[PDB]
Write a protein that binds this DNA or RNA. Structure first.
Lengths: 92, 106, 98, 82, 97, 79, 107, 92
DNA sequence: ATCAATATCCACCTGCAGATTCTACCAAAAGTGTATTTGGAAACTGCTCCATCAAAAGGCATGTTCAGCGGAATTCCGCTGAACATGCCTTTTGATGGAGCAGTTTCCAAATACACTTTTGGTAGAATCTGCAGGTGGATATTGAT
DNA sequence: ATCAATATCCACCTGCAGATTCTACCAAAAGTGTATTTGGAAACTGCTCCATCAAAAGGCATGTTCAGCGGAATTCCGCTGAACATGCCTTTTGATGGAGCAGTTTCCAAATACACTTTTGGTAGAATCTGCAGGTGGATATTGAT
């Protein structure tokens, strides 16, 4: 039964090194990650379809993010994401 | 070998996200950066909620984040609140709020 | 012979419960209601404990929120007492009656 | 004594709910109105869950069947899987 | 001859509830779309049907909103819709809950 | 300054179809404000779909998709 | 060669619907029964709304169904109205409906 | 550009033989069919995933229909669906 | 203003339910290296349709007058919910068979994939059709003053 | 209740636009027919975890008392509806240039497709550990009476 818990936990330590998280709380973050993942995936999925494309690329994820998230949260989400794709592409 | 998450410089599992995109029937094909970008966005949001949920715990003199701490973190933030406007966080309760007109006439 | 005035304790309860997160309906009775309602859809069913729990969390969450909109409607009418006309109005505007 | 199930959802409890909801004064007629609402709520959700149950050929409603139902009713719930 | 206040009002309700033409002037509506759009992105073109699609939705939404508003006024034992009513309906609708 | 093109008479007609008999004087500016927010939100998404398609023309489908995202599905224009 | 629609006794296109099911990416695979079943449901539903549409048409002395007729048919039927509770039928208007407290006089 | 028009028209003629349908109205009907198609297919799609199934069968379509349509509409859609499948299942 | 009654806050204490950290077994990932396939962008461009300019006229918006009556402030009283203390039935919490939930192994009906064949659902173009919008009048409702 | 000003109802009527209807072309489908693959029902079974039962436990039902809230009645100001005069800007019928969306061919960066090797995130059973929840004590605030 896969879950995002360990990565959730890592992120927690970079943010609040000395803070912990109960089970139920870990379980909520898990629901949260899956939910957002499904919402973004879905919208990217439609985006492609409307445009008769067969590939969901980083472009689709981006527009999906713009459509799904609130202004400021979107602004960051977009940069964070652009940053990850760049650093990734610039690396052997 | 070096994991994609490491190259992308992320904590979240790029490999898994990629996998999950394919098996999800969201499209015939899936570019290489999509799971990277996607994973990056999920880490960032995760960081946002934990960051706040965290402050919520310190503010209540507690070290372990609990649901209450996630509820108080989300509904006290305009954007996260909108993003989760149709989501119920179990064991979250509500924010303390009493309509003025209900307060005793001082 | 001490006595608190009408409303004093209520407000006190509002403060108390908006602070906590425990379920406010008694588990068993709820469980019975859930099962009874389900028996009407498929007989001889079993419920994981977590499923019944999930349902309670959802129901209370739903009702609490409905009471909020309801209180707003009561106030709209310059009252401080929620009445059925208030739950009714709220549910209609929510589209639950529309 | 022997009463009924929906009646099992008692006034004291319904009052508590109303309180977390910020209600200061509660009309006598609210209690029955609530039960009725709560019943329509549960029927809608459970009906959808049990449908997910039968589809998977099980005899046990699972917390996920309830989460999947809640999600359809646009009543998404975090914490029980999903 | 002069009809008493509210008679023509009812006449108009029956009139418009019976029909389906849009009630906002076309050109003015087009300008509002173009203005709000330009503020989002310069140099944009609109298929005429896109503008009409936006008008059909807008009035459909506004008409639905007034019914709720109307119910909120009446909830207040009033027959006059006021801002506070539009506001109670959108707060409940979830447009600012 | 086009939000003023939404005349008092038209806002009245709309309230009518909506079944409102008497209208406060403050309704009009409030309605214009409510309508502006509706449009901004629908157009923002529509135009977002246009851009993604690398088009300069906002199409009825763009509006139909935007409306669907916002939970206000529209029948009649290809959607 | 007999169309799958005829084999299935349907008017709606079984093949077009099987095809669309593939192109829409809903699963790795689509069984043969799926489109037959979905075309029937679509057919059954359009018949239902058209029955009600034509009546409204007849009721207003018109021979050609128009939007108002579809709207009247949908909003006057509990079930269709719920199925389309968040749908807007262009050029359909609303149902004539005036709140009692707004009508004049008494009794 | 395909639409369901002819089929909508055939069925129209079956119930009300002497009634026509205007262009805008047909457009609406065409939107109706695509809408319900998407909703049903979508419910099916998830239903399949929820059960680690990679095939959408007449059975997922059925449960989707039960989840999506109200009382009698659902009750009947299922009959017509079953009916159509049994008949097709026996024609060859 | 003056106590008396209670609720509320805080500093401290501590047992344990639940969170942490160790280890080993491991299939399922996830990374890598090679061969093949293909989606969709670049480049050329046919052709729809969007922007826009012009003119006309009358449907409608604007602005004002005037007062009918609806909103909202105020007083008043009956009655309905809140507080409360009295006492008991229900729910809750911890312990034990068994029924289904899954984990596994099987093997077939059924779902791709590929090659043809042939039948249909768009449509571009011109032609005849037909329902009803919109104008008309006059006979029947509806309103409001007296 | 009678009466006059107006709006409503409505069956008759025919010009016009939008709807039905051939004619031919068709390449995109949908269908017919082998070859190959496999998804998942189907039966068997071990292990959870769910339902049931009995006793440790903590909240709800009940009756009474009355204070204060909701709504009926009264009142008056003023704002909003109806009607009217005036005139402009929407809309409507056409025409035109050109932008840019949409069809079509070409070809390479990138994605699918195994195949093979490495590592890692989940489960399991064991033991260790601790953040905090209630329990206490005493101080202080809040509320309600006087």
């Amino acid at each position: 039964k896969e879950s995002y818990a360990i990565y959730v936990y890592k992120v927690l330590k970079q943010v609040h090194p000395d803070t912990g998280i109960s089970s139920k709380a870990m379980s909520i973050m898990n629901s949260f990650v899956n939910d957002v993942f499904e919402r973004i995936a879905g919208e990217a999925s439609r985006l492609a379809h409307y445009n008769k494309r067969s590939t969901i690329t980083s472009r689709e994820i981006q527009t999906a993010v713009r459509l799904l998230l609130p202004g400021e949260l979107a602004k960051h989400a977009v940069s964070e994401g652009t940053k990850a794709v760049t650093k990734y592409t610039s690396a052997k | 070998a070096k994991t994609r998450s490491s190259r992308a410089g992320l904590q979240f599992p790029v490999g898994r996200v990629h996998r999950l995109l394919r098996k999800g029937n969201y499209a015939e094909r899936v570019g290489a950066g999509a799971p990277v970008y996607l994973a990056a966005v999920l880490e960032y949001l995760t960081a946002e909620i934990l960051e706040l949920a965290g402050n919520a715990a310190r503010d209540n003199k507690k070290t372990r984040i609990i649901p209450r701490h996630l509820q108080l973190a989300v509904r006290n933030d305009e954007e996260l609140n909108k993003l989760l406007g149709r989501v119920t966080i179990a064991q979250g309760g509500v924010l303390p709020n009493i309509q003025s007109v209900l307060l005793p006439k001082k | 012979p001490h006595r608190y005035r009408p409303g004093t304790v209520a407000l006190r309860e509002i403060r108390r419960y908006q602070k906590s997160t425990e379920l406010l309906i008694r588990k068993l009775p709820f469980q019975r209601l859930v099962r009874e309602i389900a028996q009407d859809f498929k007989t001889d069913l079993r419920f994981q404990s977590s499923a019944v729990m999930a349902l309670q969390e959802a129901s209370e969450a739903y009702l609490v929120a409905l009471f909020e909109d309801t209180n707003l409607c009561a106030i709209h009418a310059k009252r401080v007492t929620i009445m059925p006309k208030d739950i009714q109005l709220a549910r209609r505007i929510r589209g639950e009656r529309a | 004594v022997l009463r009924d199930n929906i009646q099992g959802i008692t006034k004291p409890a319904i009052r508590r709910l109303a309180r977390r909801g910020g209600a200061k004064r509660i009309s006598g007629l609210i209690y029955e109105e609530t039960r009725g609402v709560l019943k329509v709520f549960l029927e809608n959700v459970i009906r959808d869950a049990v449908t997910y149950t039968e589809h998977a050929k099980r005899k046990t409603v699972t917390a996920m069947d309830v989460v999947y139902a809640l999600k359809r009713q646009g009543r998404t719930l975090y914490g029980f899987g999903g």
